[PDB]
């Protein structure tokens, strides 16, 4: 019993960050077989940020220019591309230590496990959600940029996220693996901000259930309702319309709780009204939206990697 | 206020 | 910027973890150089909880009795004997991947970082604090004891708890490792039960300096008040007393926030006797109470000018 907000085990990413230092400028790498991707504004200096022109700036730099630390042994750079907002650095050396990897792009409303790191050194891991403005509610300081985010399935790892920015509202934005920026920014210190932030409906939902599992069950109710009668107060409190799509992914928690999908919805419906008025639910006052259908699934079924 | 790259 | 619940990397803990199996029963294990650390009543059947005696039942296992195995090679145990509740397996291979360690035992309010485990493989990490209640607030189900609690400070590894049971409101009991229980409890099928559970009150504060260094600060009040007076205050919302070293340990923040710790420990009086009229701090309609001020500092960076 117990519902926490986990993280994946981090052990297969740490062995996998390196320092990569260009000048004045150290951020992280995540050194994978013999490519080092870090982004790219590691290029930059803390002058070169108001439109920083990256084509050239990268022209400038040779491999040479590319200092790269796994720990204390440096590892020679014999090779740089720029591909979109990343940096991939050949170097000589696989890295021994390189899980079963593949890079994925994430939805919004999905989540991953960030490993936060500074010098190449991690620091902490904590689980975050692709909002549906493509921004995360993170816990980031400056030198964290190359920080990754990532799912574990088995034994291999699903890189899904790179850090490289805080927009002005301390939110942070970043890239996949290929260097393609979740939402519209870019890396440039510039006035950029993020749109409406919606709640993850199907999030709260499979939330829910977790609590039903746990014994938190204050908030059932005997009425049931329609899916698009239910849309309407959802649009209503910014909360993203649920598809059917969402009812079917929310199918094994309903049949493992007996709940219908329907029935929970307007559960939420008269919580998103009358509220929770004193009462807890899995410790908090407030609805829960960073956890997915399969996010309560591994914690309650006790997955393991 | 601006982005800050980290 | 920005602020969240935050583990410490478990890879140097993943490492360690070991499966141990007595008959019917499996549960995890912690292997550093050549010892398997495990709880005790991995040796005791359903029956047995009922009113076991783990000398005797001890004493009648041999080595051979007990599967170790990291992940699917098995690791021979040449010994076994008992600390508290825990058990000691002496194998014949060191475990090459122990980091530097230490078993510490920790204090009511401080927190930890939990590798949740099966088999002994890892199933996730999430970040606790031991409850004055001695109990904690985890995500455990049948197969978990065995985990461990740590930090890591360095390099080096604090393990101060290892799990063994879950109490019948749904939180968590467990040793420090050598053995002894963080509580009143014991390992053995009887009625028990965690004491009124109370709130960490230098948690709190350090949590509210938090709100402050994030941009949240229409909490704070125009007061101040005394060490004895709010502890008197906190007593009747069943808050934990503020010691001195509390207040040391929140100096940090003071200085760097320049808002004195019994101003603040003021402003929390406000919010406890009016609440917070659907005003949300840091994201949360509740004082959160597991984030330590150390846990504050390394998260918010913040300059003290002189």
């Given amino acids: 019993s117990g519902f926490r907000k986990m993280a994946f085990p981090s052990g297969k990413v740490e062995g996998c960050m390196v320092q990569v230092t260009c000048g004045t400028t150290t951020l992280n790498g995540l050194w994978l077989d013999d490519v080092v991707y870090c982004p790219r504004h590691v290029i930059c200096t803390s002058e070169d940020m108001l439109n920083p022109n990256y084509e050239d700036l990268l022209i400038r730099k040779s491999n040479h220019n590319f200092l790269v630390q796994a720990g204390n042994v440096q590892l020679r750079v014999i090779g740089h591309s720029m591909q979109n907002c990343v940096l991939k650095l050949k170097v000589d050396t696989a890295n021994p230590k390189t899980p079963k990897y593949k890079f994925v792009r994430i939805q919004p409303g999905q989540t991953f496990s960030v490993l936060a790191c500074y010098n190449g050194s991690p620091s902490g891991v904590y689980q975050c959600a692709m909002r549906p403005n493509f921004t995360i509610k993170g816990s980031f300081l400056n030198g964290s940029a190359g920080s990754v985010g990532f799912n574990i399935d088995y034994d291999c790892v699903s890189f899904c996220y790179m850090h490289h920015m805080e927009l002005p509202t301390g939110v942070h934005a970043g890239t996949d693996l290929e260097g393609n920026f979740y939402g519209p920014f870019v890396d440039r210190q510039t006035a950029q901000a993020a749109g409406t932030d919606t709640t993850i409906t199907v999030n709260v939902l499979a939330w829910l259930y977790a609590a039903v599992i746990n014994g938190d069950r204050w908030f059932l109710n005997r009425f049931t309702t329609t899916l698009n009668d239910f849309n309407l107060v959802a649009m209503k409190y910014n909360y993203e319309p649920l598809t059917q799509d969402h009812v079917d992914i929310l199918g094994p928690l309903s049949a493992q709780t007996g709940i219908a999908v329907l029935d929970m919805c307007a559960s939420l419906k008269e919580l998103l009204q009358n509220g929770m008025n004193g009462r807890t639910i899995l410790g908090s006052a407030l609805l829960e939206d960073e956890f997915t259908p399969f996010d309560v699934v591994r914690q309650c079924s006790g997955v393991t990697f | ?6």
Avoid at chain 2, 1 to 6: D, P
């Fill in chain 2, 1 to 6: 206020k601006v982005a800050t790259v980290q």
